[PDB]
Design a protein around this nucleic acid. Structure first.
Ligand SMILES: [K+]
Ligand SMILES: [Mg+2]
Ligand SMILES: [Mg+2]
Ligand SMILES: [Mg+2]
Ligand SMILES: [Mg+2]
Ligand SMILES: [Mg+2]
Ligand SMILES: [Mg+2]
Ligand SMILES: [Mg+2]
Ligand SMILES: [Mg+2]
Ligand SMILES: [Mg+2]
Ligand SMILES: [Mg+2]
Ligand SMILES: [Mg+2]
Ligand SMILES: [Mg+2]
Ligand SMILES: [Mg+2]
Lengths: 296, 215, 58, 159, 169
RNA sequence: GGUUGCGGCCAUAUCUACCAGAAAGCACCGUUUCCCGUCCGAUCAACUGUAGUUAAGCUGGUAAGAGCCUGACCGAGUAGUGUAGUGGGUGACCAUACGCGAAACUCAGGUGCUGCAAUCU
RNA sequence: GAGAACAGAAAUCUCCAGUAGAACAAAAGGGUAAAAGCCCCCUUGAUUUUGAUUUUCAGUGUGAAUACAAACCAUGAAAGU
RNA sequence: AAGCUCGUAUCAGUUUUAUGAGGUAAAGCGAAUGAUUAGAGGUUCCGGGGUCGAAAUGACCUUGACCUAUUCUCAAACUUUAAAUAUGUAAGAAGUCCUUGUUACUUAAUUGAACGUGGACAUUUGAAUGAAGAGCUUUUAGUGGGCCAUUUUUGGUAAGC
């Protein structure tokens, strides 16, 4: 190609490829080693990661342990399941992150039989507190936050999901200086601002501001709120009822899966180019050579 | 005051090249390795004759230069300056060392004997194996006797045994003469410089069309 | 007056005169380098096992 | 003067297996080592902590201690005319589970199975391994394989 | 026939590389801060070569990066200085382009002897939507060949917009 | 079978140039009140999922493609080497005997496989 | 490499390529790429207690180093270190 | 030298089988580093010059470099590859598996860890060959100038160095 594209044979030969998930830019292996590596004097104890990822339009919350063959998911919770609990808009905001953390916490505790014990913070007030072990009883299920490549900032939705999982009764070691409301100038967090974020107060205040200001912007954003008759002041009770429903039934009813996997595969196979055989490659080479009766 | 070559005939030492650990090595006596009609195409000079070592020994750069000069002079004055391409195919990369005990009888007073005897760079030599080609020369088949005699004259400048071998290759290529002729008539050989390039059945068909229009 | 500097000459012969002896493995190796937390708990566990087996003799 | 440091003459020993530099893959840390496990020692030059001395590179030992990030390995070192017990504290990046006994373990399992089948069927065991035996007689056919006569070739140069 | 391969200005960088690091550097910083409308950043030297008195880490230049409508406005203001004429050589092979002006005072507020007179360096980085693929943290990728900005496409865009022209090749 | 999250092995996965991609996902993408970070809302943060697009990313296919991987009575039982002789040779070195046995080279084939969870025309 | 006033072959800015061809106090070798390098933020684990271990080795000392234990701390959201 | 504890016995300057470790011989250099010969195709932007060109580099030539594909030859302190010899470990009853007791360790958790109680498995009890047996201890002599041969090998022109 150019004088620097189509790299030299020696460069290609001596190039060492990174791990595939490093090439893809998806796995920080430096962080993963420290997240996954277990104290050798426990010999089987899986280290459980609360893996929180944010795609556009969805929040993924998994609880993952590591094996040689690959990571194993104990429980998973997605923000696209929040419509079942009564959240249909802002499925990637801070309140949805908190809801998904609460959902994964409740679902995992139910799966482990630790739902009745370790109820968590049912009365949410935005206070910083960890899940405490019960006297003469099993210790709380301990997981470690895995933000992946997401940057650690004060107010991040990943720490929203952390707060949700911790309030749900999972013991997730954490500090409070990354929550919204943490006063960087002092040593304490603003619990009312944290609770506001938990219940979507920032979004509702934006809705009211945009209403009292130019209205075509409030018809472009929050259009679904207008079409669903969701006023700004209803967000707090929407998220409250969502938390109650999550605690009531965090049992992961899956989707009905219409067009079953065989039909899925059959339909996907039509738009799938298949590799040519060596006979076909030789035939194409012969065709290209014979195309020069003279020279082009 | 150069030491006689018998002192450095044999490959007694490990290879001792000029490097970051020598930095003080004299220049080789032979600086020109390709001479005669070195621009001639592969087709011009089909015959190849080799002066080939029959010993594992060292050839000094002085001996290499003397033999190159002798062979070139004979072949030039007999067949013409441009009737051949002579290539010296051994390079004097091994540095010879000398521990200097020079003069001034009474040297036991100002000399340390064998203490700290590591020598300084004295000269250069090529390390040659049995069967290793020392000289190669391509020419026309009509110049075979002249080229053989030139190599035979150069043979006197070297220690040890050398042989004159008429190669079965075409010139300086690694192809037997029938095989090179076959590739040439098939059109898969192109003159690049004094050497050629060969068409391979690998690589992109676009480039294999652009070069070697044998299609 | 310089002398010889070093040689391993005859050293393997001397070693093999009384032979290279394998290190006489024992059952129950020593617990010298074992983690002290593990050793503390091991002592308590072994004491408990001894008491239980003492009461078990009926 | 002479130089015998801890990592003297380790230039190639502790190198990173060309085109296999960089981070250690997670299976190394996901392996589980128990007291009594047999491990081969091969230092990873990229992990400078818990590294074995060069003498133990390629030695196989038994784990006697398990710590947070490392194991203790028992080696028998030839010192003088006898063996001395050495106890190394090696991080898990420098050791791997030895396969020096897996053949014996599967042989034990297969021998148990063969003995069970023998005592359920009849009387024959043949449980010991045997060295490669001399070949039995065989009849070699010439149908389509008539012997082709070769002769030593004359000398030529082909240079 | 191109949905969203719409060439647009990624950014505009205004650069004043002063030989010194004192009051002249502060004045140049004020110059390219006043029109940029934002605080600029001073760039340190890395070498000590000659004739400049530049030492390692001396803060000898000052630059400012502007995007969006302000970048377009400043670009138009400097193209008015260049009389909406550029050289083909000014267009990089990667699809960016730049020019240099002296006498910065010809736009906006006048000479201001308390501030002095400086020259400036306009460089416009052009991209298409989807350049974030190159700049983001997670799943960083390389823009495809067809989506890559080219000198020809930037020249065509620059003469279509701004009604400008280029000079002989 | 496609896709996403987390992965295992870490090029058969990389690289170069083109072509294609339904559904969903992913993505680019829209916005700056709030938390947050910037010279620069480009990155990072937050908000919307609404205005738009498969252009790019991504995925797959193509290439007498580069690299890489595998195999070979391919080169080569060659180079080298353990052992032996009161073998040859002035020597340099070499041959033979009983064993072990490469690399380059050539040719052929191949171009990710796969775990857990979720999802999908 | 392609671009941008003075600005040239070397000053600053931009993009592209870039397996490390740089840097990591010093000799050299090894090691290292979302780092071990560069920049920034917080710090004193350069701390306390007394043992075991590896190298040199007599399996003495000394130096250096390894992995723990029992504390007290630093950092980070955290796993950890 | 004195013995001692045992001898239904143990081990071994050996082979085999299985499984590791190595970076020397060789090999390689149109593979990285460093050397190195030549021609060819492009940068006349090449470092510029010669020569004209009125003057440009404007056109040639050039030597030098750079880029591209080739080419000859090399490395104790180079290297992708990579032997032979030598070398670690294993080849059982202190073994394999099964049931369940202790703990202040560990686990979300009888989760595990280690140690136990109980239970099944002798012709080849789990490759070969050998075994004037194996194991153990005390105490003391002399010695602590060496040299030679084959092979590997360093300094040296070399040496009965
Ligand atoms: K001769
Ligand atoms: Mg991190
Ligand atoms: Mg020597
Ligand atoms: Mg002595
Ligand atoms: Mg190695
Ligand atoms: Mg934006
Ligand atoms: Mg973002
Ligand atoms: Mg497309
Ligand atoms: Mg290919
Ligand atoms: Mg004999
Ligand atoms: Mg870092
Ligand atoms: Mg010391
Ligand atoms: Mg070595
Ligand atoms: Mg060699």
């Amino acid at each position: 190609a150019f004088q620097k594209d189509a790299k030299s044979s020696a460069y290609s030969s001596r190039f060492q490829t990174p791990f595939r998930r490093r090439r893809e830019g998806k796995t920080d292996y430096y962080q993963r080693k420290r997240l996954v590596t277990q104290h050798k004097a426990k010999y089987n104890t899986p280290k459980y990661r609360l893996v929180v990822r944010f795609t556009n339009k969805d929040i993924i919350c998994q609880i993952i342990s590591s094996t040689i063959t690959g990571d194993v998911v104990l429980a998973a919770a997605y923000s696209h399941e929040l419509p079942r609990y009564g959240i249909t808009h802002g499925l990637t905001n801070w309140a949805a992150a908190y809801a998904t953390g609460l959902l994964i916490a409740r679902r995992t505790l139910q799966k482990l039989g630790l739902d009745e014990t370790y109820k968590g913070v049912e009365e949410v007030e935005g206070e910083y507190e960890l899940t405490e072990a019960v006297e003469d009883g099993p210790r709380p299920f301990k997981v470690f936050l895995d933000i992946g490549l997401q940057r650690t900032t004060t107010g991040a939705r990943v720490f929203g999901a952390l707060k949700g999982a911790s309030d749900g009764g999972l013991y997730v070691p954490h500090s409070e200086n990354r929550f919204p409301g943490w006063d960087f100038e002092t040593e304490e967090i603003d619990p009312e601002l944290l609770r506001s974020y938990i219940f979507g107060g920032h979004v509702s205040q934006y809705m009211e501001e945009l209403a009292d200001d130019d209205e075509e912007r409030f018809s472009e954003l929050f259009k679904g709120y207008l079409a669903d008759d969701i006023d700004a002041d209803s967000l707090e009770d929407i998220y409250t009822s969502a938390h109650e429903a999550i605690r009531a039934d965090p049992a992961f009813k899956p989707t009905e899966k219409k067009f079953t996997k065989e039909q899925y595969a059959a339909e996907s196979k039509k738009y799938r180019q298949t590799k040519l055989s060596k006979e076909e490659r030789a035939a194409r080479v012969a065709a290209k050579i014979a195309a020069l009766a003279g020279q082009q | 005051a150069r030491r006689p070559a018998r002192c450095y005939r044999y490959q007694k030492n490990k290879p001792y090249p000029k490097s970051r650990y020598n930095r003080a090595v004299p220049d080789s006596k032979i600086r020109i390795y390709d001479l005669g009609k070195k621009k001639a195409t592969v087709d011009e000079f089909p015959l190849c004759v080799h002066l080939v070592s029959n010993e594992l020994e060292q050839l000094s750069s002085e001996a290499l230069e003397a033999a190159r000069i002798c062979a070139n002079k004979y072949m030039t004055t007999v067949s013409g300056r441009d009737a051949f391409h002579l290539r010296v195919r051994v390079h004097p990369f091994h540095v010879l060392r000398i521990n200097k005990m020079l003069s001034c009888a009474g040297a036991d007073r100002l000399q340390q004997g064998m203490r700290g005897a590591w020598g300084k760079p004295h000269g250069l030599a090529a390390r040659v194996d049995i069967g290793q080609i020392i000289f190669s020369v391509r020419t026309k088949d009509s110049n075979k006797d002249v080229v053989v005699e030139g190599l035979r004259r150069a043979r006197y400048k070297f220690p040890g045994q050398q042989k004159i071998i008429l190669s079965k290759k075409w010139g300086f290529t690694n192809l037997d003469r029938p095989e090179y002729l076959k590739k040439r008539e098939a059109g898969e050989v192109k003159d690049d410089g004094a050497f050629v390039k060969f068409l391979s059945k690998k690589g992109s068909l676009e480039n294999n069309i652009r070069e070697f229009p044998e299609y | 007056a310089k002398s010889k500097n070093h040689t391993a000459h005859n050293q393997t012969r001397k070693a093999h005169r009384n032979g290279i002896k394998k290190p006489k493995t024992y059952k129950y190796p020593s617990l010298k380098g074992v983690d002290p937390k593990f050793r503390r708990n091991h002592k308590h566990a072994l004491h408990g096992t001894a008491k239980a087996l003492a009461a078990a003799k009926k | 003067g002479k130089s015998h440091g801890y990592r003297s003459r380790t230039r190639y020993m502790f190198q990173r297996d060309f085109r296999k530099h960089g981070a250690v893959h997670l299976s190394t840390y996901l392996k589980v080592y128990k007291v009594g496990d047999i491990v081969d020692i091969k230092a990873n030059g990229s992990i400078q902590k818990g590294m074995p001395h060069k003498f133990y590179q390629g030695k196989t030992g038994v784990v006697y201690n398990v710590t947070k990030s490392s194991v203790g390995v028992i080696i028998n070192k030839m010192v003088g005319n006898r063996y001395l017990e050495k106890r190394l504290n090696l991080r898990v990046e420098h050791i791997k589970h030895s396969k020096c006994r897996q053949e014996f373990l599967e042989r034990v399992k297969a021998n148990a199975a063969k003995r069970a089948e023998a005592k359920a069927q009849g009387v024959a065991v043949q449980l010991k391994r045997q060295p490669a035996q001399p070949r039995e007689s065989r009849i070699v056919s010439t149908e389509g394989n008539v012997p082709q006569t070769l002769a030593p070739v004359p000398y030529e140069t082909f240079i | 026939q191109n949905p969203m391969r719409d060439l647009k200005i990624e950014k505009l960088v205004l650069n004043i590389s002063v030989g010194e690091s004192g009051d002249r550097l502060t004045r140049a910083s004020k110059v390219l801060e006043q029109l940029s409308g934002q605080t600029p950043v001073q760039s340190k030297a890395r070498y000590t070569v000659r004739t400049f008195g530049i030492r390692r880490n001396e803060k000898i230049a000052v630059h400012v990066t502007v995007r969006g409508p302000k970048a377009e406005e400043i670009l138009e203001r400097g193209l008015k200085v260049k009389e909406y004429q550029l050289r083909d050589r000014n267009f990089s092979a990667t699809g960016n382009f730049g020019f240099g002006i002296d006498e910065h005072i010809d736009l906006g507020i006048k000479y201001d002897p308390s501030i002095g007179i400086f020259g400036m360096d306009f460089y416009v980085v052009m991209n298409r939507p989807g350049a974030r693929v190159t700049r983001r943290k997670r799943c960083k990728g390389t823009v495809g060949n067809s989506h890559k900005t080219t000198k020809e496409d930037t020249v065509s865009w620059f003469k279509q917009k701004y009604d400008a022209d280029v000079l002989d090749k």
